[PDB]
Amino acid sequence: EYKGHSGHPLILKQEGEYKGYSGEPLILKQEGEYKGYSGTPLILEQKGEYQSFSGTPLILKQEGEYRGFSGAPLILKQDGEYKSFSGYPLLLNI
Amino acid sequence: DDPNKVWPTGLTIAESEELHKHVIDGSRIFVAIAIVAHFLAYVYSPWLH
Amino acid sequence: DDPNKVWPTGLTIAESEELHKHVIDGSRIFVAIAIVAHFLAYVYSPWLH
Amino acid sequence: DDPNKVWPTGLTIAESEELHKHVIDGSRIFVAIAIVAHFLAYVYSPWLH
Amino acid sequence: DDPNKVWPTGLTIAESEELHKHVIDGSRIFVAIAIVAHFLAYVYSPWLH
Amino acid sequence: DDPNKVWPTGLTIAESEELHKHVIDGSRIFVAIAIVAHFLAYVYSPWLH
Amino acid sequence: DDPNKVWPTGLTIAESEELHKHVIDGSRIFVAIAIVAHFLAYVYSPWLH
Amino acid sequence: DDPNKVWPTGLTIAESEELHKHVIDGSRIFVAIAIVAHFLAYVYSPWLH
Amino acid sequence: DDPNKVWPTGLTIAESEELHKHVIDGSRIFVAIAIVAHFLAYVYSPWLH
Amino acid sequence: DDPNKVWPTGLTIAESEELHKHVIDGSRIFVAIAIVAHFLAYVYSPWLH
Amino acid sequence: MNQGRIWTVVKPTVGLPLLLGSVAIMVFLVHFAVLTHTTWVAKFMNGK
Amino acid sequence: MNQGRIWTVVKPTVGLPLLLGSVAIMVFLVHFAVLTHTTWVAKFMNGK
Amino acid sequence: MNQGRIWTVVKPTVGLPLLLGSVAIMVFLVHFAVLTHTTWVAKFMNGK
Amino acid sequence: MNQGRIWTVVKPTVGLPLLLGSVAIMVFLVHFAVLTHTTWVAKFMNGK
Amino acid sequence: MNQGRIWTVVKPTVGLPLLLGSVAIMVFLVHFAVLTHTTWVAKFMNGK
Amino acid sequence: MNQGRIWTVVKPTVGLPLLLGSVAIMVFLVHFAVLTHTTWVAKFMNGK
Amino acid sequence: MNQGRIWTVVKPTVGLPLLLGSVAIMVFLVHFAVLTHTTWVAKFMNGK
Amino acid sequence: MNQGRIWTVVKPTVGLPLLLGSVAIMVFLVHFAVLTHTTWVAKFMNGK
Amino acid sequence: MNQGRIWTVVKPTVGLPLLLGSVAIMVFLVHFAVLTHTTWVAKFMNGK
Ligand code: BCL
Ligand code: BCL
Ligand code: BCL
Ligand code: BCL
Ligand code: BCL
Ligand code: BCL
Ligand SMILES: CC(C)=C/C=C/C(C)=C/C=C/C(C)=C/C=C/C(C)=C/C=C/C=C(C)/C=C/C=C(C)/C=C/C=C(\C)CCCC(C)(C)O
Ligand SMILES: CC(C)=C/C=C/C(C)=C/C=C/C(C)=C/C=C/C(C)=C/C=C/C=C(C)/C=C/C=C(C)/C=C/C=C(\C)CCCC(C)(C)O
Ligand SMILES: CC(C)=C/C=C/C(C)=C/C=C/C(C)=C/C=C/C(C)=C/C=C/C=C(C)/C=C/C=C(C)/C=C/C=C(\C)CCCC(C)(C)O
Ligand SMILES: CC(C)=C/C=C/C(C)=C/C=C/C(C)=C/C=C/C(C)=C/C=C/C=C(C)/C=C/C=C(C)/C=C/C=C(\C)CCCC(C)(C)O
Ligand SMILES: CC(C)=C/C=C/C(C)=C/C=C/C(C)=C/C=C/C(C)=C/C=C/C=C(C)/C=C/C=C(C)/C=C/C=C(\C)CCCC(C)(C)O
């Protein structure tokens, strides 16, 4: 056991339960549903699809390639090798 | 599965909804306390005078 | 098959789209509240007078 | 089963509520010490005079 | 292999380019809104008068 | 179990209590040195003069 | 092996050099735009006048 | 057991205390140099004059 | 073994020294560019005039 | 065992001591350069004049 | 009250510390805002 | 409303905290900007 | 007192250091606030 | 439009939050720069 | 002295560096607070 | 152009966000430096 | 010297860097405190 | 030119980003230092 | 020259970057200290 330099005891313990100093109860228990203090309901249940506020539609469906809002093309393809936009070479190598 | 699916957070929907039940209750208590703090500020501070 | 692929985030496309459905709805409610806040500012602040 | 569930944090509900028992006690001690410090300030400072 | 290779990020080239399709489209919408904002600033602010 | 259970930190209750024994001792030594520093400040500084 | 060695980043030498090809090209485009911005500053700002 | 136990840091108590021997010896050298630094300050600076 | 040892960083000694050769040569380039910038500042700024 | 032990850092003692020999030699060169920089500041600056 | 499923996709050991911490941070920001842009709060602290 | 696949590639336990956190941060930045660059908000806080 | 289950979903080795550290930080924020927006705390520290 | 493969080597859950977050930061930095170095934005906020 | 089980749930290699580091940080905060809000500490450092 | 093997030893998902972000940061630093240490940029922003 | 078991519960590759770093940091904080709240150090730096 | 084994003990994906980032940061620090403690740099930026 | 077993307990990929980085940081802190608390360094930078 550590002696320390500041007298004895250095710690407190008990076998049964937390012996708190600030009286009792220290906690409330709950055998069932949550008993809130701000009335009910606390949450809204969702049985199926999200019954949004702020009207519908709420997302846009997509069933293929992406359609831009800013005109085609959105991407430049590549095959073979990277095309330089700033001349050649783009590297030095052994 | 679905109605008892354990999601990647380790909670079911029921456990998630139980947890959020605490989050809503805490928010309502916080607002109620803040409302009285605003009422006290209205009575004692010059704020809306 | 493609629609039932579980992506590296652990979501399907349909789960992702249901999640984003909350994000868009929240954004609309946020803007609605903000519009009324700007209307109140227009009525009571000197902002556009 | 249920009360012996080890939750993702590695605690049962009982160990969680036991841990929170220290948290509530520590909070109450903190407030009592602070109430005295506010009383001392009321006595020895111009704050509410 | 290569056109169906899954890269260390967990995407194919096709999925990477599909993702970047949103990045480019969003950037163009951003610039379009910003162009209007600079036009409004030119009309109403002293900036270039 | 309980006297020999190893908790997620890798300590028993006994080893936790032995570790905290050093924390309490260090806290007491710290406060002792601070009390001397406070006495020297009360002697030499204008603080409470 | 040697020419096809996967290095700890998960890239071959060829994939690394292909990636750096984009880095050099992007750097050159950046400098070109910056040169025009410096020329615009030389024309319209007092900078070197 | 006890002297041979490898603790969660990967050290025995003997290796832990042998490491701390360097920490203590380093602290003493640091204090010795700092004492001379305060002596030099006392000689040349106005500090305690 | 020794010359072929893969060290915990995932490099051999020869790979480490070839990598550092780029670091050394890059440092020499940086210094050369900086020497010219200091010469330019000596010519055109009042720095050492 | 002991002199051929590999420690949790992945080094032997001999590898550790050989590594530190670079750290010591680097510290000496840093000090040597700093001594001359201090000598130059003594000659050209007002510092100790 | 309809967002109850958020904790299926955001870890509670992340979002609850971030929620409570952000509220605490931003409560203090509003106090420091009103404290630095009014006289009457500083007067109330300064008292007589 | 067409970005709904963002959550197949950005983890919600990252991006939803980052979204809501950034919105809250930048709401506060706008309040601090207007508060520090106007008279009438401080006058409103200071009241009578 | 009804929040006792919080430690089933928030890790104690995160939430307790954050709880104690946040209180300690925000105790100091209130001290620095009152210290800078009053005269009498500085008088008390300055003494005679 | 030729950088479309970037997401084969930069993780989307890293680079997409970094991109959108950096752009939001850059927007606010420009607003603060113009707000602090002009009169007319403050006059616009201050209004009547 | 009754909190000695804290180290069954808070990792010592986290909580002990945080404890000692927080104390050391906040010692310096009190020194800087008193140093900046008094004259006599500056006089003591300045000496003759 | 001779450094093309850097990405065999630095991970692209680290070095590329660091590269692009560091450039964006230090672009803004040069703008803020010139904006604060000149009159003509502020005059340009302030306009008429 | 009685704390020599600290390294059975704090990782040396954490605590030793944290120790030496915190010492070096706080040495500098003391030099800056004395440098900014005295005249004689600046006079010594300024020399003739 | 004798430290070339440092990359057997320091990870290149750590030390190289740190090296380049540190030089970049500290180049900017020297620029900001000389910019703020001289007239002629600001004069050069301000031009006519 | 007697601490060289430090690298059996501190990871070199942690401690060497922290060492070199902290030295570089604190070199700059000393330069900034002397620069801001003297005239002759700014006079040297400002030249003629
Ligand atoms: C002072 C040096 C040590 C110290 C040494 C001792 C010693 C020695 C003993 C204790 C004992 C006790 N210690 Mg201890 N203890 C210190 C700090 C603390 C602090 C704290 C917040 O600082 C606390 C709460 C405690 C707690 C306690 C109790 C558990 C216990 C009973 C107290 C009592 O009334 O004893 C009785 C009262 C006293 C011991 C104090 C009497 C003081 C007299 C009146 C004045 C002496 C002046 C002196 C000569 C001045 C010059 C030298 C120095 C400036 C002190 N210690 C410091 C770090 N502690 C006791 C124990 O273990 O019991 C089993 C015990 O005998
Ligand atoms: C005072 C020292 C301890 C304390 C010791 C006790 C004791 C002893 C008991 C309780 C009990 C109770 N405690 Mg407790 N308790 C404290 C702090 C708290 C706080 C808090 C926010 O600080 C709360 C909410 C509670 C909660 C409660 C209730 C569950 C319960 C019944 C209330 C009551 O009248 O208690 C008693 C009163 C108070 C806690 C505060 C009274 C405050 C009034 C306004 C002023 C009192 C001045 C006093 C007489 C001055 C002289 C003496 C000292 C200088 C203090 N405790 C502090 C930390 N508590 C009781 C119970 O049911 O236990 C099973 C009980 O017997
Ligand atoms: C005021 C103290 C509690 C509270 C206690 C209750 C109680 C009790 C009930 C509700 C009920 C409701 N609460 Mg609640 N509730 C609070 C905070 C909130 C907040 C919020 C953002 O602050 C919200 C949105 C809600 C939401 C709701 C609805 C779900 C529901 C119907 C509202 C209604 O008009 O009821 C009618 C009107 C009211 C509840 C408000 C009455 C106001 C009057 C002037 C004063 C009340 C004094 C108070 C009850 C005294 C004791 C507590 C303290 C000493 C102050 N609560 C706080 C934390 N709430 C009711 C319900 O339908 O449950 C099924 C119900 O019975
Ligand atoms: C106003 C309260 C709700 C709202 C409730 C509804 C309702 C109800 C409906 C829609 C519908 C629509 N909504 Mg919605 N919606 C809101 C916010 C939004 C926002 C946004 C950025 O704020 C957007 C883009 C949308 C988008 C849309 C479209 C998908 C759709 C067709 C447009 C239309 O004319 O709707 C209708 C009109 C509007 C959205 C705005 C009208 C505003 C008028 C001028 C002022 C109303 C003041 C009000 C009476 C004040 C007091 C009460 C409360 C304080 C609000 N909503 C807010 C959060 N929305 C429709 C739909 O999908 O039907 C199936 C529909 O009928
Ligand atoms: C305006 C709404 C959309 C938009 C709608 C379209 C449409 C519709 C089409 C394209 C097409 C194209 N778009 Mg687009 N596009 C936008 C933003 C962009 C931006 C950008 C940086 O902002 C770029 C580089 C592009 C790129 C391109 C090319 C790939 C392609 C050929 C352009 C062209 O000159 O067509 C000819 C010219 C035009 C389409 C428009 C010219 C606009 C002029 C120069 C400016 C008018 C400003 C206006 C007054 C602003 C206020 C009104 C509204 C509030 C916006 N788009 C915005 C977000 N784009 C075309 C294509 O090839 O599709 C297959 C096509 O059909
Ligand atoms: C200007 C737009 C592009 C550009 C477009 C090209 C083109 C096109 C070519 C190169 C070529 C080269 N480029 Mg490049 N390049 C740019 C940026 C760079 C930068 C840089 C730091 O900015 C560097 C170092 C390089 C590097 C190089 C070399 C590898 C190579 C030989 C250059 C040379 O002197 O050729 C000799 C000189 C020249 C090519 C320039 C001549 C300019 C003439 C005198 C004026 C033309 C004005 C023009 C009509 C104006 C309108 C159109 C556009 C605005 C240009 N590029 C930018 C991003 N580059 C060449 C190559 O690799 O060929 C196989 C080549 O043909
Ligand atoms: C700077 C200037 C001048 C102006 C700025 C002004 C502004 C913008 C002010 C903005 C203010 C805002 C946005 C305020 C928002 C406040 C909010 C959202 C408050 C929220 C409070 C939430 C609370 C108290 C939540 C509590 C949650 C609790 C207790 C959770 C408990 C969970 C438990 C027990 C776990 C249960 C687990 C299971 C499995 C169910 O057992
Ligand atoms: C800024 C202004 C103006 C005002 C603010 C003023 C305020 C609010 C000031 C607040 C001050 C406060 C809160 C001060 C608190 C100080 C405290 C709590 C000090 C604590 C000190 C603790 C110490 C020294 C702990 C030491 C622990 C040690 C040495 C542990 C050793 C562990 C070991 C050896 C491991 C043992 C392992 C086993 C296996 C058991 O042997
Ligand atoms: C503060 C004051 C007053 C003064 C300071 C002034 C100073 C010091 C200024 C310094 C300025 C400096 C150092 C500026 C440097 C600018 C630099 C280096 C710019 C670099 C730009 C680089 C760019 C745009 C790189 C882009 C890279 C891209 C797009 C990469 C794409 C990669 C892809 C698509 C992956 C390909 C993958 C495979 C598998 C190969 O397909
Ligand atoms: C702000 C104002 C105005 C005032 C504030 C003033 C204040 C509060 C000042 C406070 C000052 C304080 C608290 C100073 C504290 C200084 C301390 C604690 C210094 C400690 C120094 C420690 C040192 C040098 C430690 C060295 C450790 C070493 C060399 C370790 C080596 C380990 C090795 C070789 C590993 C051995 C491995 C095995 C296998 C065992 O051999
Ligand atoms: C703020 C004010 C006003 C005043 C403050 C003034 C103060 C407090 C100033 C303090 C200054 C101090 C504390 C300065 C300290 C400087 C120090 C400690 C410098 C250290 C330098 C260290 C260096 C250069 C280390 C170099 C290490 C190297 C090159 C390592 C190489 C390793 C390699 C090659 C690995 C080899 C591996 C094997 C296995 C051998 O192959």
Numbering used by the authors:
A (entry chain S): 4 to 97
B (entry chain R), C (entry chain B), D (entry chain P), E (entry chain D), F (entry chain N), G (entry chain F), ...: 3 to 51
K (entry chain Q), L (entry chain A), M (entry chain O), N (entry chain C), O (entry chain M), P (entry chain E), ...: 1 to 48
From the paper:
LH2 complexes are oligomers of a basic α/β-apoprotein dimer, each of which binds noncovalently three molecules of bacteriochlorophyll a (BChl a) and one or two molecules of carotenoids. Light energy absorbed by LH2 is rapidly and efficiently transferred via LH1 to the reaction centers, where it is trapped in the primary charge separation reactions. Overall, the cryo-EM maps and the corresponding models of the four LH2 complexes are very similar, all with a ring-like structure in which nine α/β-heterodimers oligomerize to form a nonameric complex. The most unusual structural feature of these four LH2 complexes is the hitherto unknown γ-polypeptide, which partially encircles the LH2 complex toward its cytoplasmic side.
In the deletion strains, PucA-LH2, PucB-LH2, and PucE-LH2 complexes are produced at all light intensities, whereas PucD-LH2 is only made when the cells are grown at low light intensities. Interestingly, PucD-LH2 has a completely different spectroscopic form compared with all other LH2 complexes, such as those from Rbl. acidophilus, Rba. sphaeroides, and Phaeospirillum (Phs.) molischianum; its “B850” Qy band in the near-IR region is strongly blue shifted so that it merges with the B800 band, producing a single enhanced absorption peak at 803 nm. However, there is a significant difference in the two residues, α-Tyr-44 and α-Trp-45, that in PucA-LH2, form H bonds to the C-31 carbonyl groups of the paired BChls. In the PucD-LH2, these two key residues are α-Met-44 and α-Phe-45, resulting in a loss of these H bonds and blue-shifted absorption. The average Mg2+ to Mg2+ distance of the B850 dimer in the PucD-LH2 is 9.6 Å, and from dimer-to-dimer subunits, it is 8.8 Å. Finally, in the case of the PucD-LH2, there are no H bonds to its B850 BChls. A single C31 H bond produces LH2 complexes with a B850 Qy band at about 825 nm, and where there are no H bonds, this Qy band is blue shifted to about 800 nm. A careful comparison of the positions of the B850 bacteriochlorin rings in the PucA-LH2 and the PucD-LH2 structures shows that, within the accuracy of these two structures, they are essentially identical, and moreover, there are no significant differences in any of their Mg2+ to Mg2+ distances. Therefore, in the absence of these “locator” H bonds in the B800-only PucD-LH2, there is no clear structural indication that the strength of the exciton coupling will be reduced, which could have, in principle, resulted in a blue shift in the B850 Qy absorption.
